[PDB]
Each structure stands twice: as structure tokens, then as C-alpha cells.
């Protein structure tokens, strides 16, 4: 139930592309009539890369929470997740701004901050936590999509240190990651504060991570605002105590951020 035979995937459209791969919309179609089960089908577009994808499909398949993408199984060569038509939460939020109110915004926290707490209790750092990695199962209910980045930490060590600078855009990155490429658990909570930023401005592009901190600035001139103190500004209308959750994520020592298990009760208690 597992393996998907590459004959039976018919193309339909693209999701996503980037870090060497891509994500396709196909139909799981064995009758050929058109009435079988959309999928969302990730596959590489080098050896360090195959590597890198293996890694991926072996993350998520062991991975079994209703806040995660669920994995469906492999063709043999891709990877076959369960296709959510609602899409990302970056473009649910621009498109539904007028129908979701703040409780709304905090059940959406409140289940990201659950994915997490599960992901971090599988040793795994996601390390590219964002909207747009988000994904939106219903109006109620949102999944932590896209391991392309995600590590596993080994038993006696609780970072993980990359030779070359990330790839993703700047805007979300803990300063350790900006200065040394040092990555754990706790980066994961610097970008969920960025994730918080995120959904209280329903990702409206003009004041995105990208704009407002440009506006206030350049990976160099970026660390030295962030080192300085400065941070992004409280979203408009914005409930103080969410602002105040997300300064705590963006504490500038890592030991000194909450923990997704410290978080979870804090945003039920503002949900409720
Ligand atoms: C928002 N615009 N999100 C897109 C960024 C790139 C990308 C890849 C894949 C998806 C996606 N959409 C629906 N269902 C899925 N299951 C797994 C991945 C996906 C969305 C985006």
C-alpha cells in the first residue's frame, strides 16, 4: 500500500521547486479514468543530494502526527505525501484575512507549536519553518510540511553545525545560524517566533519578514540588527501578549528561548 507504481502517477501540475528538487500535483490513477486519488509527489531534479532525499523520505515516514504531513510511500525514485488542496497557510492567510479572527490565528499556533513539540521529541530540527511550509488540512486544522532541510540530532549532542551558509531566505534564521550555521531545537523556536510574526499579519507581503526587515536594515547587516536588540515590529492590531510570546522566542541566547512544551499551554491559556 506503500509502493506506487510510476506508471499509474499521472502528472497533473507543480507545487513547488527549489533545493534541487520539485513538488508535482498527480493523480494515483491505476484504473486510468480519472477517478483515482490526488497525491503531492516530491522528486530530485548529485550523490551528496541522493543522499539528502533518502534522508527526507526516512524522516518523514517515521514520523505520525495529525500537526505532519502524512508520507504515503515511495515510487521506485519519489516520495508520495497526501495532497492537501487548501494549500500553504502564506496564501490561505492573504486570501481568507477577513474571515479568521485571532482565536483562529492562535488554534493555528497552537497546533504548529504541538507538530513541534513532536518533532523535537524525535530528535528532528526542521530548520525551515515557515508559512510557507505550512500546510492547511481545513479551516480548523493545519500540518508542518516540507523536511527537505530537517535533521536528525544525534543521542549525545543536541546541535548541528553545516559546512557552507543555508540557502533559504535570511529573514527566518536564528542569529547562531546567521554567525556560525549552528542549528537545534531551539533555532526551530527562533523561527516560529518568525511563524507567529507570520500569521498575526495574515503573511500580508507588505510588512512580510523580507520588507519590514529590509526596511529597517546584508546577512552581515541583518546579525548586526538582530545582535543590537532591534526585532520585528508588533504586526498591526496584534494582542500584546502574542507580541510578548514572540520577543520570547527571539531571546538572543538559545538556552534562553522557551521550550514548544513551555509554549503549548501559553497559547491554549490565549486561545481559550
Ligand atoms: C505555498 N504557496 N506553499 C507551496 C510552496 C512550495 C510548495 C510545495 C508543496 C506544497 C503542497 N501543497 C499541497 N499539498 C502538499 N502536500 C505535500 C506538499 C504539498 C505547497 C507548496
Same mark, same amino acid.
Request: aromatic share 10%; net charge neutral.
Given at each position: 500500500? =506503500?509502493?506506487f507504481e510510476?506508471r499509474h502517477l499521472?502528472? #497533473?501540475?507543480?507545487?513547488?521547486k527549489?533545493n534541487?528538487?520539485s513538488?508535482?500535483?498527480?493523480?494515483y490513477?491505476?484504473?486510468?479514468?480519472? =477517478?483515482?486519488? @490526488?497525491?503531492?509527489?516530491?522528486?530530485l531534479? *548529485?550523490?551528496? !543530494?541522493?543522499?539528502?532525499?533518502?534522508? &527526507? #523520505?526516512?524522516? @518523514?515516514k517515521? /514520523?505520525h502526527?495529525?500537526?505532519?504531513?502524512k508520507?504515503?510511500?515511495?515510487?521506485?525514485?519519489?516520495?508520495?505525501?497526501?495532497? +492537501?488542496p487548501? *494549500?500553504?497557510?502564506?496564501?490561505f492567510?492573504q486570501?481568507?484575512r477577513?474571515?479568521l479572527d485571532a482565536?483562529?490565528?492562535? +488554534?493555528?499556533?497552537? !497546533? #504548529?507549536?504541538?507538530? %513541534?513539540?513532536?518533532?523535537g521529541?524525535?530528535?528532528?530540527?526542521?530548520?525551515?519553518?515557515?508559512?510557507?511550509?505550512?500546510?492547511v488540512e481545513?479551516?480548523?486544522?493545519?500540518?508542518?510540511?516540507?523536511? *527537505?532541510?530537517?535533521?536528525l540530532?544525534?543521542?549525545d549532542?543536541?546541535?548541528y553545525?553545516?559546512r557552507?551558509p543555508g540557502?533559504?531566505?535570511?529573514?527566518?534564521?536564528?542569529?547562531?545560524?546567521?554567525?556560525?550555521?549552528?542549528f537545534s531545537?531551539?533555532?526551530?523556536?527562533?523561527?516560529?517566533?518568525?511563524?507567529?510574526? &507570520? /500569521?498575526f =499579519?495574515?503573511?500580508?507581503?507588505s510588512?512580510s519578514?523580507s520588507?519590514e526587515?529590509?526596511? %529597517?536594515?546584508?546577512?552581515?547587516?541583518?546579525?548586526?540588527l538582530?545582535?543590537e536588540?532591534?526585532?520585528?515590529?508588533?504586526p498591526?492590531?496584534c494582542p500584546?501578549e502574542?507580541?510578548?510570546? %514572540?520577543?520570547?522566542c527571539?531571546?538572543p541566547?538559545?538556552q534562553?528561548?522557551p521550550?514548544?512544551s513551555? /509554549?503549548?499551554?501559553?497559547?491554549?491559556?490565549?486561545?481559550?
Amino acid at each position: 500500500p =506503500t509502493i506506487f507504481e510510476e506508471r499509474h502517477l499521472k502528472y #497533473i501540475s507543480q507545487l513547488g521547486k527549489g533545493n534541487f528538487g520539485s513538488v508535482e500535483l498527480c493523480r494515483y490513477d491505476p484504473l486510468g479514468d480519472n =477517478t483515482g486519488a @490526488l497525491v503531492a509527489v516530491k522528486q530530485l531534479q *548529485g550523490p551528496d !543530494q541522493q543522499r539528502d532525499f533518502q534522508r &527526507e #523520505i526516512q524522516i @518523514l515516514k517515521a /514520523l505520525h502526527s495529525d500537526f505532519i504531513v502524512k508520507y504515503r510511500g515511495v515510487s521506485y525514485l519519489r516520495l508520495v505525501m497526501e495532497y +492537501l488542496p487548501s *494549500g500553504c497557510l502564506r496564501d490561505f492567510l492573504q486570501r481568507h484575512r477577513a474571515r479568521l479572527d485571532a482565536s483562529r490565528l492562535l +488554534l493555528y499556533s497552537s !497546533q #504548529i507549536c504541538k507538530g %513541534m513539540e513532536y518533532l523535537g521529541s524525535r530528535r528532528c530540527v526542521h530548520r525551515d519553518l515557515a508559512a510557507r511550509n505550512i500546510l492547511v488540512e481545513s479551516e480548523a486544522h493545519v500540518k508542518i510540511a516540507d523536511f *527537505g532541510l530537517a535533521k536528525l540530532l544525534p543521542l549525545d549532542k543536541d546541535y548541528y553545525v553545516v559546512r557552507e551558509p543555508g540557502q533559504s531566505p535570511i529573514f527566518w534564521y536564528a542569529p547562531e545560524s546567521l554567525s556560525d550555521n549552528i542549528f537545534s531545537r531551539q533555532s526551530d523556536v527562533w523561527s516560529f517566533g518568525v511563524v507567529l510574526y &507570520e /500569521l498575526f =499579519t495574515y503573511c500580508d507581503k507588505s510588512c512580510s519578514p523580507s520588507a519590514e526587515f529590509l526596511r %529597517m536594515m546584508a546577512l552581515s547587516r541583518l546579525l548586526e540588527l538582530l545582535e543590537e536588540g532591534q526585532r520585528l515590529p508588533a504586526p498591526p492590531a496584534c494582542p500584546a501578549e502574542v507580541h510578548e510570546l %514572540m520577543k520570547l522566542c527571539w531571546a538572543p541566547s538559545p538556552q534562553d528561548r522557551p521550550s514548544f512544551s513551555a /509554549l503549548g499551554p501559553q497559547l491554549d491559556m490565549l486561545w481559550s
